[PDB]
């Protein structure tokens, strides 16, 4: 929102740089759904999508691969978008946010992917720009969670065709929050798996996975709290761009965020306890070794010196040829060992 | 009026007057030589390396009109960065850092700058500095510093200082990477010491860079008539550079604080292994030596008569018992 583009060291002035590490593909897809007819337009050129600024019907423009900085700059210039908005679009490492401008609304959100067999939680930034009667959308890799809205527009289901671009923005944000819900479900599955594995098989890999889950939950916290704040600000006042008839719907989304926030600390609490549990559990394993070792001492270490007490090379030893002295002393020794084993069975060791 | 710093080894005074036509400079301990340049219409850069001598600082203050409080602050090396403004002069304190690759610590120096009329006065503490780029730019006419007034000189000094911060950040990144491979592949206790030292260094960097960001932001937004309206965008550039530095320090602290966790939690399962080896060796040999003592008991009344070869039978019994202990283990695979 500042009047000046923020400088960087080592770059020529007024340079826009992509920050993320995704450069595989690029795509543009335009959906101009009217009250009666809709259009789908997939392309790689950027001069074809630009004229769609002034379409009367609501329009949804989606650009994948913001690694192509020139396309982002061109689309920003053609739509009267601030250079700092472009810098925010191309800066991946920032938390979700919302900024209200006179001509458009700018939103930065995160969508997550979670992979089994590789416990890595990956965040992909999407930028939404509500401008007049159009919705620009900037992803950075192929694939999203907005397919349900696509089928809703394609097959006339729901209310979306009846309404303007504000309802489209609401639909996109609600889809993103539902993706958050399914992410939480996946993390619940993995945390149950981890809890069982830690409680019954403590090794090094379990601790590595537990700390990985800890960092993943921390990142979810850091991305979900600003999401709650921006949904609040979206539904609170928003005079200019969003009609009142829409702000109840945004209300629901806000509620969802609160739930998600609560859940994460539930999860957080569990994993924040899990580490401690692991320590106890691993100590338990060592205890068992203790038990065994203790036993192999108690019935074997003392016997030795009695097996040495009257097993000396001592000239003054009376019981040298006693009547069955060896059998009776060995029987006494075996009795002592048996009764001490029973005594340790009393402690159940 | 006492020098808080503990460094008094070397003292020098170095001055350069410069202009569009030609420049002059000198390196002498004379303190009177700096006085006439107060009246020079040209911009001049006057530096007093040694601030341990209070008399020269007092004389410079009384000649240039520095208020006693900030003059006393100049000697106070233990001061957070700040700014102060006057009707004729402005006063800014910054810090310069020296970091060594081999010795994992950093040293801090308080550098005072005073801007008044056409003269910029620097108060360092010791020889060795990071103003060589701007100094060479003035000497060799490279850049546009000579054309501009005395304020661009202050801008260039702050620019050189932030560039030194950037090279320090490069070194810290280097060491953090090396430490990452180290902790991933060679975890031990001196690694813990090194990580803790690095964390303290980054904490110091953060707590010094944030006041410096405030210094630059105040110097930009306040923009008194002394600081002029022509150096303002350049000060905005320096402010953005400070933003970069702060974000980099923050993420470095995140990484280094995250390094130590898995190693620290990895304890108490090596004790499991030493117990495993201890118990496997004990439960094999100690009962065996007990058996040896029993059948070697010197009682004088035993079946010492061989009958079948007895010594081979006893050795075979020992071997069989050892084998049965080996078999009994790793059935639950705990070892």
């Amino acid at each position: 929102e500042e009047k000046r583009l923020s400088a960087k060291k080592g770059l020529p002035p007024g340079t826009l740089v992509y920050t993320g590490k995704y450069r595989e593909d690029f795509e543009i897809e335009v959906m101009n759904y009217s009250i009666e007819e809709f259009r789908e337009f997939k392309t790689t050129d950027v001069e074809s999508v630009l004229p769609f600024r002034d379409s009367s019907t609501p329009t949804w423009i989606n650009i994948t691969g913001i690694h192509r900085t020139d396309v982002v700059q061109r689309v920003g210039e053609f739509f009267g978008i601030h250079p700092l908005v472009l810098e925010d679009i191309l800066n991946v490492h920032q938390r979700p946010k919302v900024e209200f401008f006179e001509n458009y609304v700018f939103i930065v959100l995160k969508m997550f992917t979670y992979d089994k067999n590789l416990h890595e939680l990956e965040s992909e930034q999407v930028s939404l720009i509500l401008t007049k009667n159009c919705v620009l959308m900037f992803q950075e890799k192929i694939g999203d969670v907005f397919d349900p809205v696509r089928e809703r527009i394609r097959y006339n289901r729901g209310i979306i065709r009846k309404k303007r671009a504000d309802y489209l923005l609401y639909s996109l944000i609600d889809a993103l929050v539902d993706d958050y819900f399914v992410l939480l479900e996946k993390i619940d599955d993995e945390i149950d798996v981890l809890e069982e594995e830690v409680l019954e098989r403590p090794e090094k890999e379990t601790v590595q996975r537990t700390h990985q889950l800890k960092r993943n939950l921390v990142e979810l916290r850091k991305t979900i709290w600003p999401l709650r704040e921006v949904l609040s600000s979206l539904y609170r006042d928003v005079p200019p761009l969003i009609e009142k008839e829409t702000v109840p719907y945004f209300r629901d989304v806000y509620d969802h965020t609160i739930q998600i926030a609560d859940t994460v600390e539930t999860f957080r609490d569990i994993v924040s306890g899990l580490l401690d549990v692991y320590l106890s559990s691993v100590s338990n394993k060592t205890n068992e070794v203790m038990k065994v070792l203790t036993i192999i001492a108690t019935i074997f270490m003392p016997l030795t010196f009695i097996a040495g007490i009257y097993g000396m090379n001592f000239e003054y030893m009376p019981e040298l040829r006693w009547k069955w002295g060896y059998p009776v002393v060995l029987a006494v020794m075996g009795v002592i060992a048996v009764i001490m084993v029973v005594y340790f069975k009393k402690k159940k060791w | 009026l006492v020098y808080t710093g503990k460094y008094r080894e070397d003292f020098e005074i170095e001055v350069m007057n410069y202009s569009i036509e030609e420049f002059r400079e000198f390196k002498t301990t004379d303190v009177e030589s700096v006085l006439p340049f107060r009246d020079s219409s040209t911009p001049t850069w006057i530096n007093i390396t040694g601030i341990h001598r209070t008399d020269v600082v007092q004389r410079v203050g009384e000649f240039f009109g520095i208020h006693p409080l900030v003059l006393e602050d100049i000697l106070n090396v233990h001061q957070r960065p700040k700014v102060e403004f006057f009707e004729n002069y402005v006063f800014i304190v910054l810090k310069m850092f020296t970091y060594d690759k081999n010795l994992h610590e950093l040293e801090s120096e308080q550098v005072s700058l005073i801007l008044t009329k056409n003269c910029v006065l620097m108060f360092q503490e010791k020889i060795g500095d990071v103003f060589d780029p701007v100094r060479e730019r003035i000497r060799y006419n490279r850049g546009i510093i000579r054309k501009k007034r005395a304020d661009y000189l202050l801008y260039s000094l702050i620019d050189a200082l932030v560039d030194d911060y950037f090279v320090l950040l490069e070194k810290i990144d280097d060491e953090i990477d090396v430490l990452e491979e180290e902790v991933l592949e060679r975890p031990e206790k001196e690694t813990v010491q090194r990580t803790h030292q690095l964390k303290r260094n980054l904490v110091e960097l953060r707590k010094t860079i944030w006041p410096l960001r405030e210094v630059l932001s105040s110097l930009y937004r306040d923009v008194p008539p002394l600081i002029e309206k022509e150096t303002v965008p350049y000060f905005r550039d320096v402010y953005d550079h400070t933003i970069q530095i702060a974000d980099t320090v923050e993420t470095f602290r995140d990484i280094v604080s995250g390094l130590l966790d898995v190693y620290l939690s990895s304890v108490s399962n090596k004790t499991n292994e030493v117990m495993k080896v201890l118990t496997i060796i004990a439960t094999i040999f100690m009962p065996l030596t007990f058996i040896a003592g029993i059948y070697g008991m010197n009682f004088e009344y035993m079946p010492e008569l061989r009958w079948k070869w007895g010594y081979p039978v006893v050795l075979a019994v020992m071997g069989v018992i050892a084998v049965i202990m080996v078999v009994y283990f790793k059935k639950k695979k705990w070892l």
Partner: antibody
Amino acid sequence: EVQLVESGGGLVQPGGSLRLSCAASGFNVSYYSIHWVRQAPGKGLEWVASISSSSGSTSYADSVKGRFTISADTSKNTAYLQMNSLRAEDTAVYYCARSYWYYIWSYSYGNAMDYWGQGTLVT
Amino acid sequence: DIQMTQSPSSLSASVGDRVTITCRASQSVSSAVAWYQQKPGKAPKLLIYSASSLYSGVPSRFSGSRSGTDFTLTISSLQPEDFATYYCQQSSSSLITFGQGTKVEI
């Protein structure tokens, strides 16, 4: 879709001046950086110059400092490298390369010469 | 000015064996180093950027690594077309600088 073609080199007596033109197709010079690189045949690559037409900031190698002059005609969408007082070692192939910056940390930025031209001999 | 040293000067090997090339700098550069191929009579082609990141369309057999100021390029599974001349760059400073050049032969 992106192509770079170079023209204006191949032969000139030592001590002269000659300008190499870099024409870019399916690509806009406004939003990217253009690098001139040198390679003597049978030897290694040597960076020469870099121009960012968006601002006009100009970077030169340590070998040809001040000797050369690089510019970019945004309207014509070309990059010009004018070499002056050609020396004995300057006989080499000159390559034109596209540049894009990436992100490592908030303080360090680096660019990669992903696209290259054909490269033209100069003697 | 900053200079980069790329070693070994040459490396002769068959196919199917890991090929490692190392590359260092006079003063440490963070990660702004890139690895390029060069065929005889062909312009260089980017392989690795940011010292560890594969390009688009480059085959995964190539892989970059960093250890402080020591960068490496490795070819775990060589293919018959891999034999070429390999180069570093430095992008940390505004003054780009290459390596000497390492040629892989049979």
